[PDB]
Ligand SMILES: CC(C)(COP(=O)(O)OP(=O)(O)OC[C@H]1O[C@@H](n2cnc3c(N)ncnc32)[C@H](O)[C@@H]1OP(=O)(O)O)[C@@H](O)C(=O)NCCC(=O)NCCS
């Protein structure tokens with residue numbers, strides 16, 4: 659069955675696997691640096707992540723960070739999308755951020771991507787564009 | 800006998816995909832460049848693996864190094880990476896030799912690769928008989944090895 663558990667260092671390979679499985683919100687040049695092992699492990703080790711398994715298959719990953727409160731990543735393999743996994747991960751990360759004391763959470767996403775409407779459906783608002791042309795979204799406590 | 804019995808080698812298959820990424824992002828030189836992002840997307844990475852020119856190395860139970868050749872679009876070294884903690888143990892040379900021999904056995908008259916100019920890898924390749932022939936469209940050093 660589908661399980662959600664805390665994302666830990668041992669999940670590093672599967673974080674990459676899920677992240678590179680998606681067909682929208684592909685990795686952009688300015689984001690390469692955050693996947694280098696030392697930085698990816700630092701992100702995981704903030705403790706704001708969950709990973710979803712379908713049996714022994716890794717299905718989705720979501721993590722929040724304080725660097726600034728941010729959704730560091732939210733990705734579900736295409737074959738597991740539209741089953742509630744992304745919403746379940748986002749809800750866990752969002753609650754974690756607010757319990758840590760965040761007043762607002764930020765994220766960026768490809769403008770007009772399916773993810774943009776998904777976040778808006780969950781109460782996030784587009785507030786502009788960053789220097790890289792990504793849509794900036796905010797959710798307040 | 801030349802290498803610790805703890806170090807084993809497996810033919811690279813689709814099931815190794817997560818560990819290919821893990822090893823690739825562990826290195827501190829020849830970091831991923833913008834023009835190379837596309838080759839890591841799952842469908843493209845699996846297509847690369849499926850050309851059949853790859854091996855992966857484990858140190859004990861820990862994945863340690865990966866190397867793979869391609870014949871399409873042309874004979875190339877598609878990737879060669881060893882985790883920092885497992886470098887200088889013969890793994891990169893072993894993977895390079897395995898891939899190189901497979902390519903030549905299957906008909907390659909020459910193999911090319913690109914690497915960061917002046918990187919440790921550049922000298923490593925030259926030590927194994929590769930020659931710098933120039934630079935590519937991004938300023939990477941282009942190297943060749945001939946049959
Ligand atoms: C975006 C993503 C994380 C969402 O996760 P998911 O598991 O597919 O989403 P869920 O199943 O939890 O929720 C989807 C549901 O939300 C609702 N929904 C989604 N977008 C909506 C919109 N624009 N308006 C109204 N409702 C919407 C729908 O009910 C939808 O169900 P449906 O697809 O069957 O029609 C996931 O699809 C994904 O990884 N996409 C590719 C990578 C990506 O863009 N990640 C975001 C990086 S910023």
Ligand SMILES: CC(C)(COP(=O)(O)OP(=O)(O)OC[C@H]1O[C@@H](n2cnc3c(N)ncnc32)[C@H](O)[C@@H]1OP(=O)(O)O)[C@@H](O)C(=O)NCCC(=O)NCCS
Nearest residue numbers: 826829880881886887888889890891892914920922923926
């Ligand atoms: C480059 C890389 C693949 C080499 O693999 P490795 O497992 O560390 O190398 P090996 O143990 O098989 O061989 C190393 C030996 O090659 C020889 N060698 C290497 N560079 C040399 C040079 N410039 N001149 C002469 N001999 C050299 C040395 O004998 C060296 O021994 P040492 O490590 O004790 O000093 C690996 O270090 C790596 O992944 N580096 C980072 C990522 C990278 O640059 N990959 C290449 C992408 S194009």
